[PDB]
Design a protein around this ligand. Structure first.
Ligand SMILES: *[C@@H]1O[C@H](CO)[C@@H](O[C@@H]2O[C@H](CO)[C@@H](O)[C@H](O)[C@H]2NC(C)=O)[C@H](O)[C@H]1NC(C)=O
Ligand SMILES: *[C@@H]1O[C@H](CO)[C@@H](O[C@@H]2O[C@H](CO)[C@@H](O)[C@H](O)[C@H]2NC(C)=O)[C@H](O)[C@H]1NC(C)=O
Ligand SMILES: *[C@@H]1O[C@H](CO)[C@@H](O)[C@H](O)[C@H]1NC(C)=O
Ligand SMILES: *[C@@H]1O[C@H](CO)[C@@H](O)[C@H](O)[C@H]1NC(C)=O
Ligand SMILES: *[C@@H]1O[C@H](CO)[C@@H](O)[C@H](O)[C@H]1NC(C)=O
Ligand SMILES: *[C@@H]1O[C@H](CO)[C@@H](O)[C@H](O)[C@H]1NC(C)=O
Lengths: 134, 69, 138, 138, 67, 138, 69
């Protein structure tokens, strides 16, 4: 949410390396959004056995999230009951706007059918029923 | 000219040193082409010339190669 | 028609003397290329619009004589009609020409390959040993 | 003999213009040749400080096709044997490319030159790193 | 683009409807130059099956569609 | 003797480009002359259905000045006594003006032609007359 | 130096005979204009680079003799 508010969105184009003529190889062989997600935000490593620094630029966001949460629930009821009016209402408007914007794209009504064409050979696996229950 | 320089590369084995568009006429710059003469006589003349030569030493009972007849 | 130097435009060369002897004697790649390309661009360019008309007129002159075109008119010299086995039709000459020429190609390819290998010692760095021969060096 | 100093050009009208695309007749090859000659004139005046009068008859063109792709090379003004080495044509064009693109309304993906690729611009956007400002802001 | 760059066909002649026909013609014309080309085999209703990893949907597809 | 078929041209770089303005050397007069020759070539192929090979040596230029204003007129390809009547040059340019403006990045106020003025476009904006819709809306 | 027709480029005219008598006798505006402009563009263009040098050399030849130019 903070990396918005700029017209050339940071996840729109790749950065250039030291030699400012060719793209970074990680961003070249893949999409720029995958690069901004896996390298500029997370800086993800190669295995679960490779832990690294604490990566300050995530501590600020974590502290902001927890501070806002603590602000809203300072007293349980009588304080969350005043924020719920907006918090549980704004989504049902933004989502209607996004539904109207989505159902008029190119692949709409062509990607929805993939959601509603079941295959009767998948219903007999225990995994699907367990996941449905969970 | 496109066909001219296509056939030259394929039959004769000769390539031009600068490209030539359709405002040229390279064959027309030859004496026989631009003076309306038939050009095939120089082909068939070459083959008759050796048919006669070869069928004439065999009358003279030649011995060795043809070119010493 | 005549051709003249780019440096001293006041000396022009005819073809029968002057432009022939360059192509026949010189060994200078650049002078041969100049003569070759210049004779075609100075005099070939003039003849094209006339040749396009000569073709059209000659074709009518032949079709009005019960021939197909001027080509089939020219091949009329080799034709024989009704003498029992010595007949020879104007359309056979093309088969004979194209069928005798395919037996020469083996010898001409070796003769052509041998000359190429010997020009590469006269104009090195101008002839590739797997290509054709430039037209102005012949 | 001229195919190692040639440059390949590929043009894709119906992509860039989409429609509205003019038709590529010969009066477009004329404009293209004279624009390349202009580029060469500029390169030899702001690099080598000479003054050479290239014309549109010094740009030779070969292998035209429907894809609208061809080959070209450049010679000295009146010296047919003097081919400007390809590496200098690749600099003249790198210099005046933004101006050649305009004469045709193409945009560097529809006027590929096949051997000279675009480079110009680094991402020097943020002096502030807006995100931490938003951070403090809230 | 690869096909029309190979044989130098007109820009507006090769489209989605008559792609296979032009491919067949260009092969049967010059087998050598056609065989050395590289093609991509990919169809609709097959990119929908690209599995999205955990917590990698709201950040990979929605930002890519918003841009 | 040639001043009643001439057209006046006035160019104002530092206005349109503001800065970034290139300098107007002779390699710009060359490009301008060849672009005018291209315009004439097109006019005589889509109106009169002829094919005339105008070159950049058929555009004569007079009275160059610092304001970057000059005069020009056009002659037949190789016939110095044949001046294309001014009223046809005024049509060739009206036709290809949008394309001549681009080669230089000027915009029809910085490339005045002094006798041919721009016209193209009527105001066919509203199909709804938005104001009464807003009226009803509230 | 010589000048020749745009129509039939194979007849060229010198100046002392041929180009003088046109200018001296003809009454055809177009033929006079052709001869006039052509003699200057075909032969005036050659002499300019030489004249620019002749000037410079002659000026030194004079300044070395206690003259101004
Ligand atoms: C035309 O250009 C060629 C270069 O391609 C010039 O040929 C050079 O000539 C000089 C002296 O005549 C030689 O020293 C060079 O070796 C030649 N060049 C090459 C590449 O070998 C030729 O002189 C030019 N012609 C004119 C009239 O200027
Ligand atoms: C050059 O153009 C002029 C026109 O400006 C031509 O002059 C015309 O010549 C014909 C016959 O020679 C006359 O009937 C016309 O009256 C002439 N024009 C004018 C305006 O009087 C001249 O023929 C052209 N030259 C060439 C070689 O084509
Ligand atoms: C950038 O340029 C330098 C030469 O200055 C070169 O050594 C380096 O390989 C280039 N970088 C890339 C990624 O090609
Ligand atoms: C990303 O991680 C690597 C290794 O963990 C580190 O070297 C690099 O500095 C990190 N990125 C930034 C912007 O600090
Ligand atoms: C593509 O080009 C061929 C070449 O002859 C032509 O026959 C065909 O009609 C063209 N395609 C279309 C859709 O016009
Ligand atoms: C191309 O044509 C040849 C000709 O026989 C054929 O054998 C081959 O299978 C074809 N391949 C493709 C990919 O069209």
């Amino acid at each position: 949410l903070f990396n918005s508010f700029q017209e050339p969105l940071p996840w729109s184009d790749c950065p250039l390396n030291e030699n400012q003529t060719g793209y970074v190889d990680e961003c070249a062989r893949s999409s720029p959004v995958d690069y901004f997600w896996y390298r500029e935000t997370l800086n993800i490593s190669t295995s679960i056995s490779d832990s690294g620094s604490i990566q300050w630029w995530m501590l600020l966001c974590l502290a902001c999230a927890w501070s806002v949460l603590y602000m809203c629930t300072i007293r349980g009821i009588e304080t969350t009951g005043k924020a719920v009016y907006i918090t549980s209402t704004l989504p049902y408007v933004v989502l209607t706007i996004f539904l109207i914007r989505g159902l008029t794209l190119k692949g709409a009504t062509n990607g929805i059918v993939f959601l509603f064409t079941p295959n009767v050979t998948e219903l007999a696996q225990p995994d699907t029923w367990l996941d449905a229950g969970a | 000219m496109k066909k001219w320089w296509e056939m030259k590369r394929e039959i004769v084995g000769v390539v031009e040193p600068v490209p030539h568009d359709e405002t040229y006429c390279d064959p027309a710059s030859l004496f026989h082409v631009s003076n309306d003469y038939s050009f095939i006589r120089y082909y068939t003349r070459t083959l008759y010339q050796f048919q006669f030569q070869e069928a004439l030493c065999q009358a003279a009972k030649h011995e060795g190669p043809l070119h010493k007849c | 028609g005549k051709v003249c130097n780019p440096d001293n435009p006041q000396e022009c060369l005819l073809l029968e003397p002057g432009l022939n002897e360059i192509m026949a004697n010189s060994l200078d790649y650049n002078e041969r290329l100049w003569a070759w390309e210049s004779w075609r661009s100075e005099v070939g360019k003039q003849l094209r619009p006339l040749y396009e008309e000569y073709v059209v007129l000659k074709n009518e002159m032949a079709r009005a004589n019960h021939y197909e075109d001027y080509g089939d008119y020219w091949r009329g010299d080799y034709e024989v009609n009704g003498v029992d086995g010595y007949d020879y039709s104007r359309g056979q000459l093309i088969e004979d020409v194209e069928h005798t020429f395919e037996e020469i190609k083996p010898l001409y390819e070796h003769l052509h390959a041998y000359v190429r290998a010997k020009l590469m010692n006269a104009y090195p760095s101008y002839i590739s040993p797997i290509g054709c021969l430039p037209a102005h060096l012949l | 003999p001229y195919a190692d100093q040639s440059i390949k050009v590929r043009i894709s009208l119906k992509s860039a213009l989409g429609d509205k695309a003019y038709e590529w007749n010969d009066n477009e090859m004329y404009l293209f040749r004279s624009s390349v000659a202009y580029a060469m004139r500029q390169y030899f005046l702001k690099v080598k400080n000479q003054m050479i009068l290239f014309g549109e008859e010094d740009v030779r063109v070969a292998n035209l096709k429907p894809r609208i792709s061809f080959n070209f090379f450049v010679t000295a003004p009146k010296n047919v044997s003097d081919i400007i080495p390809r590496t200098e044509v690749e600099k003249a064009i790198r210099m005046s490319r933004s101006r050649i693109n305009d004469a045709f309304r193409l945009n560097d993906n529809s006027l590929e030159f096949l051997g000279i690729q675009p480079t110009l611009g680094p991402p020097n956007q943020p002096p502030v790193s807006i995100w931490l400002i938003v951070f403090g802001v809230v | 683009l690869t096909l029309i760059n190979g044989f130098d066909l007109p820009e507006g002649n090769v489209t989605q409807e008559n792609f296979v026909d032009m491919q067949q013609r260009c092969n049967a014309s010059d087998p050598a130059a056609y065989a050395q080309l590289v093609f991509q085999t990919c169809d609709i209703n097959a990119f929908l099956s690209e599995a999205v990893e955990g917590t990698g949907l709201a950040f990979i597809v929605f930002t890519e569609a918003i841009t």
